[PDB]
Write a protein that binds this ligand. Sequence first.
Ligand SMILES: Cn1c(CNc2ccc(C(=N)N)cc2)nc2cc(C(=O)N(CCC(=O)O)c3ccccn3)ccc21
Lengths: 222, 219
Amino acid sequence: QVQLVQSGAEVKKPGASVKVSCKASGYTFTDYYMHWVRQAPGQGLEWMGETNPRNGGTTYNEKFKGKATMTRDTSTSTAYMELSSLRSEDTAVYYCTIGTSGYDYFDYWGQGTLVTVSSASTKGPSVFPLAPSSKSTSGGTAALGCLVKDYFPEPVTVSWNSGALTSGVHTFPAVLQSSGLYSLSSVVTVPSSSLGTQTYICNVNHKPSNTKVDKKVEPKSC
Amino acid sequence: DIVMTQTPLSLSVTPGQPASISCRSSQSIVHSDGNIYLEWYLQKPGQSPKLLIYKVSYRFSGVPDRFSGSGSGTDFTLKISRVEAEDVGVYYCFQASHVPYTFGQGTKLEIKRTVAAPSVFIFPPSDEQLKSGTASVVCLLNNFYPREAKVQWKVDNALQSGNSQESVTEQDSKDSTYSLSSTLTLSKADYEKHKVYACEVTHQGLSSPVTKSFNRGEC
Ligand SMILES: Cn1c(CNc2ccc(C(=N)N)cc2)nc2cc(C(=O)N(CCC(=O)O)c3ccccn3)ccc21
């Protein structure tokens, strides 16, 4: 019931601004402080500040003061974190989190928003099927998947059959290509016996390019 | 700011065996109210951190009894009595007694399971990709342990170099295995010069290498 839904990943040029949103549901918005947490490899996890949803005041971590501006809209139960004058060093995953037992712990977190600061323009991926064939069977198991090629920046999310297929799914960490573009694959192992009855669709999402691709992976007669 | 230092940096534990992680604060962390706001979080790749322990020793509702916290002053410890597959990931300690609230650097827990040989699968380039002038050949190494699986590409038995990229998954939360994907990328013109495309796999669980191959144009 308690949900924190954040805005999607974005690519921003150095010097620009970005406003990340955190839509709250399943609780009375004014009951708990809203927190923002940064995650970047190296500096790791950092607490940026806490917003009082009643008076709208924020207690900031000195490190993020000025750079990050936190607000809340009580009419839409949405908290905002705005980063101004973006620099390469601001590339990170930004989480919103709340504590429902005074100031004891953080029990609920948003899904995170990856903000990428770069001069390179966004590029949507090409989606190619990795069709099951005699070359992708092992015992009575068939492997199939999708190849998500040439996108920028990260991330791409891949679901199978709109999230109904999760068992045996492996969405590989992205690889950086020579071109500066990323590539990844998402695979699943299924019974080879039911390739004639079951339908397998990879749902590819690249939020920075507003790319949404649904690819039906058809068995190969080879 | 208060620095939270975790020891060790990494841990590899056999299922059913204990795990211990230390967290040291650079200063005392007694809040003005008199309590110590020391928490432990578990984060899995691509997921948000998840609460385990709060106020040094309190177990959060729903967390298994195998997890426990202790400590005083500047020395805190997280204990897992018997590790389970589901415990994989990165453990972080965190203080909220003084502003700014600070996190530890993290401790990676690996589950030391039995050796598992990879299952190997190969995918020729798709007909839709071949229409674009590029050929990507995918070799999948599925559910193996330990992580060190070596892939070599051979085109008409000639060892390849500089035309492939690989990626390993995080350790699986259910079976404690890893999977690896290797992709060979050539132009349609380079792809058409050769017949036999093969990926040879070496691993601790394989007495002899496993090769998966196909003849170009046979599909
Ligand atoms: C600083 N602080 C925080 C920051 N959150 C936080 C969460 C988790 C953690 C952590 N991870 N340890 C650390 C900090 N939350 C607080 C809640 C209260 C409080 O008691 N009330 C109730 C007041 C009434 O009776 O209405 C309240 C509720 C809403 C607005 C204002 N006051 C006081 C102080 C608080």
